[PDB]
Tab-separated table of C-alpha atoms and ligand atoms in Angstrom:
chain	number	residue	atom	x	y	z
A	1	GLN	CA	69.582	-101.210	-83.750
A	2	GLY	CA	66.089	-101.969	-85.306
A	3	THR	CA	62.685	-100.744	-83.984
A	4	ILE	CA	61.551	-101.313	-80.371
A	5	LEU	CA	57.859	-100.469	-79.680
A	6	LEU	CA	57.017	-99.716	-76.004
A	7	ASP	CA	53.346	-99.721	-74.888
A	8	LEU	CA	52.927	-96.568	-72.681
A	9	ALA	CA	50.807	-96.795	-69.468
A	10	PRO	CA	47.777	-94.412	-69.593
A	11	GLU	CA	49.155	-93.052	-66.212
A	12	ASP	CA	52.477	-92.088	-67.985
A	13	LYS	CA	53.132	-88.318	-68.544
A	14	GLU	CA	54.146	-89.160	-72.163
A	15	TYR	CA	50.863	-91.026	-72.891
A	16	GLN	CA	48.799	-88.187	-71.320
A	17	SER	CA	50.775	-85.454	-73.208
A	18	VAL	CA	50.441	-87.234	-76.597
A	19	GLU	CA	46.713	-88.072	-76.116
A	20	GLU	CA	46.020	-84.416	-75.157
A	21	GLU	CA	47.871	-83.033	-78.233
A	22	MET	CA	45.879	-85.506	-80.385
A	23	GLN	CA	42.443	-84.642	-78.834
A	24	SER	CA	42.978	-80.827	-78.458
A	25	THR	CA	44.064	-80.397	-82.129
A	26	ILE	CA	40.788	-81.944	-83.552
A	27	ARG	CA	39.065	-79.443	-85.914
A	28	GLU	CA	35.813	-79.368	-87.960
A	29	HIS	CA	36.996	-79.849	-91.574
A	30	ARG	CA	35.623	-77.966	-94.618
A	31	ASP	CA	34.496	-81.364	-96.134
A	32	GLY	CA	32.043	-81.978	-93.192
A	33	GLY	CA	33.852	-85.260	-92.358
A	34	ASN	CA	33.702	-86.747	-95.917
A	35	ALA	CA	37.420	-87.846	-95.920
A	36	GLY	CA	38.154	-88.784	-92.255
A	37	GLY	CA	34.639	-89.330	-90.837
A	38	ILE	CA	32.337	-87.454	-88.411
A	39	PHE	CA	33.657	-87.155	-84.810
A	40	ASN	CA	34.641	-84.565	-82.139
A	41	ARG	CA	36.777	-87.013	-80.069
A	42	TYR	CA	39.050	-90.089	-80.361
A	43	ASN	CA	38.905	-93.265	-78.276
A	44	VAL	CA	42.658	-93.936	-77.774
A	45	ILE	CA	43.325	-97.718	-77.661
A	46	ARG	CA	47.068	-97.420	-76.954
A	47	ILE	CA	50.151	-95.251	-77.530
A	48	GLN	CA	53.498	-96.907	-78.356
A	49	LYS	CA	56.866	-95.130	-78.146
A	50	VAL	CA	59.008	-95.892	-81.245
A	51	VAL	CA	62.742	-96.407	-80.474
A	52	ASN	CA	65.034	-96.956	-83.489
A	53	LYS	CA	68.729	-96.046	-82.930
A	54	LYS	CA	69.559	-95.963	-86.711
A	55	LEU	CA	66.500	-93.805	-87.617
A	56	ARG	CA	67.309	-91.449	-84.673
A	57	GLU	CA	71.015	-91.055	-85.684
A	58	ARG	CA	70.074	-90.245	-89.342
A	59	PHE	CA	67.343	-87.798	-88.165
A	60	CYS	CA	69.885	-86.031	-85.873
A	61	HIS	CA	72.573	-85.864	-88.655
A	62	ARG	CA	70.028	-84.410	-91.181
A	63	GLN	CA	68.770	-81.903	-88.540
A	64	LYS	CA	72.357	-80.591	-87.960
A	65	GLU	CA	72.768	-80.315	-91.800
A	66	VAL	CA	69.447	-78.377	-92.134
A	67	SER	CA	70.339	-76.175	-89.076
A	68	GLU	CA	73.682	-75.180	-90.747
A	69	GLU	CA	71.791	-74.360	-94.049
A	70	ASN	CA	69.207	-72.138	-92.230
A	71	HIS	CA	71.159	-69.870	-89.784
A	72	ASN	CA	71.074	-72.564	-86.998
A	73	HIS	CA	67.214	-72.780	-87.252
A	74	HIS	CA	66.229	-76.442	-87.791
A	75	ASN	CA	62.602	-75.490	-86.758
A	76	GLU	CA	61.747	-78.905	-85.251
A	77	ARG	CA	57.967	-79.395	-84.710
A	78	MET	CA	55.884	-82.284	-83.328
A	79	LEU	CA	53.359	-83.072	-86.106
A	80	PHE	CA	50.779	-85.795	-86.915
A	81	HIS	CA	51.114	-88.189	-89.917
A	82	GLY	CA	48.469	-90.510	-91.425
A	83	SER	CA	49.334	-93.112	-94.101
A	84	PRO	CA	48.308	-96.630	-95.216
A	85	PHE	CA	52.123	-97.405	-94.902
A	86	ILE	CA	52.369	-96.489	-91.145
A	87	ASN	CA	53.378	-100.125	-90.329
A	88	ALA	CA	56.392	-99.852	-92.727
A	89	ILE	CA	57.357	-96.339	-91.431
A	90	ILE	CA	57.737	-97.391	-87.738
A	91	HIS	CA	60.066	-100.280	-88.811
A	92	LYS	CA	62.015	-98.757	-91.766
A	93	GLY	CA	61.448	-94.945	-91.466
A	94	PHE	CA	59.930	-92.438	-93.931
A	95	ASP	CA	60.904	-94.101	-97.295
A	96	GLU	CA	60.522	-91.541	-100.181
A	97	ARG	CA	58.936	-94.617	-101.879
A	98	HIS	CA	55.333	-94.900	-100.496
A	99	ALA	CA	55.835	-92.225	-97.742
A	100	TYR	CA	55.478	-89.689	-100.656
A	101	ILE	CA	51.920	-88.721	-101.794
A	102	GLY	CA	50.513	-85.959	-104.070
A	103	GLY	CA	48.525	-82.902	-102.868
A	104	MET	CA	47.849	-79.171	-103.461
A	105	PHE	CA	51.484	-78.554	-102.302
A	106	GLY	CA	53.130	-81.093	-104.677
A	107	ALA	CA	54.732	-84.542	-104.169
A	108	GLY	CA	56.267	-85.112	-100.702
A	109	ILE	CA	55.676	-86.441	-97.167
A	110	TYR	CA	52.600	-84.746	-95.588
A	111	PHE	CA	52.253	-83.852	-91.862
A	112	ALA	CA	49.642	-81.774	-89.973
A	113	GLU	CA	49.546	-79.762	-86.697
A	114	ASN	CA	45.863	-80.902	-86.426
A	115	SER	CA	45.441	-84.665	-85.692
A	116	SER	CA	42.045	-84.581	-87.527
A	117	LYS	CA	43.823	-83.432	-90.754
A	118	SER	CA	46.205	-86.455	-90.532
A	119	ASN	CA	43.103	-88.657	-89.853
A	120	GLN	CA	41.906	-87.725	-93.433
A	121	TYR	CA	45.040	-89.512	-94.864
A	122	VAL	CA	44.979	-92.755	-92.721
A	123	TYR	CA	43.067	-94.767	-95.413
A	124	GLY	CA	44.612	-92.827	-98.380
A	125	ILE	CA	44.029	-89.528	-100.287
A	126	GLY	CA	40.635	-88.065	-99.239
A	127	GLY	CA	40.195	-91.189	-97.041
A	128	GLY	CA	40.687	-93.536	-100.068
A	129	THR	CA	38.116	-96.406	-99.885
A	130	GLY	CA	37.893	-96.048	-96.050
A	131	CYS	CA	38.621	-98.947	-93.646
A	132	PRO	CA	39.870	-102.221	-95.248
A	133	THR	CA	37.005	-104.278	-93.618
A	134	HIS	CA	33.845	-102.115	-94.162
A	135	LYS	CA	35.149	-99.791	-96.996
A	136	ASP	CA	33.838	-96.986	-94.678
A	137	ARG	CA	35.728	-93.626	-94.364
A	138	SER	CA	33.655	-92.917	-91.139
A	139	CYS	CA	34.074	-96.437	-89.559
A	140	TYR	CA	33.539	-96.247	-85.745
A	141	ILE	CA	34.565	-99.967	-85.346
A	142	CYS	CA	37.994	-100.471	-87.020
A	143	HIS	CA	41.122	-99.388	-85.081
A	144	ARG	CA	43.032	-96.648	-86.933
A	145	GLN	CA	46.708	-95.779	-86.443
A	146	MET	CA	48.439	-92.396	-86.807
A	147	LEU	CA	51.948	-91.149	-85.920
A	148	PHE	CA	53.064	-88.186	-83.802
A	149	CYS	CA	56.453	-87.276	-85.301
A	150	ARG	CA	59.503	-85.069	-84.702
A	151	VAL	CA	59.798	-83.081	-88.012
A	152	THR	CA	62.758	-80.920	-89.121
A	153	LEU	CA	61.190	-78.044	-91.176
A	154	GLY	CA	64.347	-75.886	-91.650
A	155	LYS	CA	63.437	-72.967	-93.979
A	156	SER	CA	59.713	-73.245	-94.920
A	157	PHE	CA	58.024	-71.893	-98.065
A	158	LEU	CA	54.618	-70.500	-96.924
A	159	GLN	CA	51.899	-71.358	-99.517
A	160	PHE	CA	48.509	-69.587	-98.969
A	161	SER	CA	46.785	-69.604	-102.454
A	162	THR	CA	44.689	-72.597	-103.739
A	163	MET	CA	47.276	-73.146	-106.558
A	164	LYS	CA	48.629	-76.590	-107.660
A	165	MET	CA	52.476	-76.537	-107.254
A	166	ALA	CA	55.044	-79.315	-108.015
A	167	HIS	CA	57.761	-78.463	-105.385
A	168	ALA	CA	58.930	-75.599	-103.049
A	169	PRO	CA	61.250	-72.934	-104.557
A	170	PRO	CA	65.032	-73.539	-104.111
A	171	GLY	CA	66.710	-73.150	-100.653
A	172	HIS	CA	63.531	-74.348	-98.797
A	173	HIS	CA	63.488	-77.617	-96.714
A	174	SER	CA	59.637	-77.734	-96.370
A	175	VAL	CA	56.290	-76.227	-97.497
A	176	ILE	CA	53.701	-74.964	-94.982
A	177	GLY	CA	50.441	-75.008	-96.992
A	178	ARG	CA	47.294	-73.109	-95.847
A	179	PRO	CA	44.534	-72.919	-98.514
A	180	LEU	CA	39.240	-73.177	-92.555
A	181	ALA	CA	43.055	-72.741	-93.098
A	182	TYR	CA	44.564	-75.796	-91.286
A	183	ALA	CA	48.335	-75.982	-91.965
A	184	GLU	CA	49.861	-78.958	-93.818
A	185	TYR	CA	53.654	-79.459	-93.548
A	186	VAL	CA	55.423	-81.073	-96.558
A	187	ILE	CA	59.031	-82.375	-96.383
A	188	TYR	CA	61.017	-83.999	-99.237
A	189	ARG	CA	63.639	-86.072	-97.297
A	190	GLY	CA	62.519	-89.016	-95.077
A	191	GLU	CA	65.368	-88.210	-92.602
A	192	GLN	CA	63.565	-84.903	-91.776
A	193	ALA	CA	60.963	-86.901	-89.740
A	194	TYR	CA	61.248	-89.369	-86.837
A	195	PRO	CA	58.121	-91.429	-85.959
A	196	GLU	CA	58.167	-90.845	-82.137
A	197	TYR	CA	54.685	-92.217	-81.239
A	198	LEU	CA	52.292	-94.769	-82.801
A	199	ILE	CA	48.704	-93.967	-81.733
A	200	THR	CA	46.000	-96.698	-82.082
A	201	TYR	CA	42.490	-95.177	-81.889
A	202	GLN	CA	38.837	-95.144	-82.986
A	203	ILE	CA	36.958	-92.023	-84.088
A	204	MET	CA	33.908	-91.657	-81.755
A	205	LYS	CA	30.338	-91.099	-83.089
A	206	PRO	CA	29.047	-87.831	-81.493
B	301	LIG	ZN1	35.649	-100.653	-90.504
């Protein structure tokens, strides 16, 4: 019932689909690569499928709950996640302890539709101290990991202003924050995300 990790063959449709979503969603960030480093491309080392029967059942139960609360619209999206606690997430799921961070859109679990936005969170807020080994936010050596996740958004609060908020208004299951304007997706319950794919990669020096 615990986690099984399956290495995907680069010739597999799933590997190719995930790598292409990861590469195609790279953007040039407003910070000129301060947080996540300077790159236009990833070198994908491997992609692992994450199979956890218990996490999947709880995700499916929560999605049905959210669907019923939002006129049968669970609004599932495939979104990227970066976190220093990725290793814990694939084994134990999104734990509101340590999966939660702060940001412009309040405390919660942060996802992005752009892989390069999630890359800014891999080593912590604003890239933290960068890679453990070289303390380098733009390390081209160290292997990074990010997740590509199934995320139940239900009813989203759309935030567009650069205003610090604590939490979404009542009756909302997520925030979509857009302060260019790359969208960040915040959820408040760990069971609203399933870590489908573990991507091991390097950022490439242009
Ligand atoms: Zn490094």
